[PDB]
Structures are given as C-alpha cells and as structure tokens.
Amino acid sequence: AKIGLFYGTQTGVTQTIAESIQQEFGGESIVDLNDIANADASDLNAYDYLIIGCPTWNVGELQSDWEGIYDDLDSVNFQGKKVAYFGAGDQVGYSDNFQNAMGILEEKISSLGSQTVGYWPIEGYDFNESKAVRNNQFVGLAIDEDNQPDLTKNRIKTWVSQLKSEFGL
C-alpha cells in the first residue's frame, strides 16, 4: 500500500488503535499494518508515507519492541518521507511522562531527515510534562484509553481526516 503503519504494543491497546486508523483510511488497499516486533529497519524504506505507533511504558520509556529496533533506525534514509505518529498513554497515572515514547521516536526519525505531519492540540488533555510536545502541540495523535476511552473514536476520525490532506489522499 501507499502508507506503511508500524506499531509496537505490550497489552494490545496500540494494535487496536492501529486497526482503527487503517479502517478509517479505507482498509488494506490504502494502509499496510506492520508489527514492529516482526520487522527489520529496512522495511521502513519501502514507503514514502509512514505512520508510527508506540505506547509509553515504564515511566517515560519506549515499548520494548521499538526499543529493540531503535539503534537500527540510523541505517534508513528518511529524507523525503512524511511521517505521522500516534501513541497510547495514561495522563493521570504518568502526568510527567505522558506520551514520551511518541516524542522519543519523532525526535529520532526527524533527525534522520523526515518531515513530521499530524500535529495535534494539547488542550483536550491534562498532564504536566511530555517529551512529545513541541511549541504547544503534540507531534502526533495522543490516545488515552485508560482515562478517555469515550474520545478515542472521534479523535481517530478527526486525525485521519487531517492526515488524508497531508498524504495526498
């Protein structure tokens, strides 16, 4: 497909979100779903449009599967690629490390020459600190199933609608 979605997940929440995003875009013919646990860094090279999903774990850390491939990311040339990010987190329980994984990955991938698209407003959340915030916006979609599951469906619909414009759909 045109868009490659790569996600990592520990308790399955990020996978469910990935599946909803693929569905909102139009299905398998538009978005390829890939579990980063089963991929090689070079698989990211096959796409010009990428969506990266990762939940934050263990107080500000990357989900372990993303942690595993992190050092290999240097071998991929992201210049010219448009990359969007999404993450699952818990704003109440980890108010000072909310969605940090998403920010760690964005800082790394953009330093390799990619363009970040998909900024999201921070006003619909209550947290103290997040490494995924730059100039008062999140660098990608923040989902919180632990505290705001009622908002997930419309957050995804709205985000995907905005991304379509960025990805030329």
Ligand X SMILES: Cc1cc2nc3c(=O)[nH]c(=O)nc-3n(C[C@H](O)[C@H](O)[C@H](O)COP(=O)(O)O)c2cc1C
Q: Which residues bind ligand X (CB under 6 A)?
A: 9-14, 55-60, 63, 88-90, 94, 97-100, 145-146
Q: Which is nearer to ligand X, 21 or 81 (CB)?
A: 21
Question: Nearer to ligand X by C-beta: 78 or 84?
Answer: 84
DSSP-assigned letters across all residues of the chain: --EEEEE--SSSHHHHHHHHHHHHHTSTTTEEEEEGGG--GGGGGG-SEEEEE--EETTTEE-HHHHHHGGGGGGS--TT-EEEEEEE--TTTTTTSTTHHHHHHHHHHHHTT-EE---EESTT---S--TTEETTEESSEEE-TTT-GGGHHHHHHHHHHHHHHHHT-
Min separation Cβ 36 and ligand X, Å: 11
Q: How far is the CB of 102 from ligand X (least distance, A)?
A: 9
Which position's Cβ is nearest ligand X? 89
- Minimum CB–partner distance for residue 161 and ligand X (Å): 23
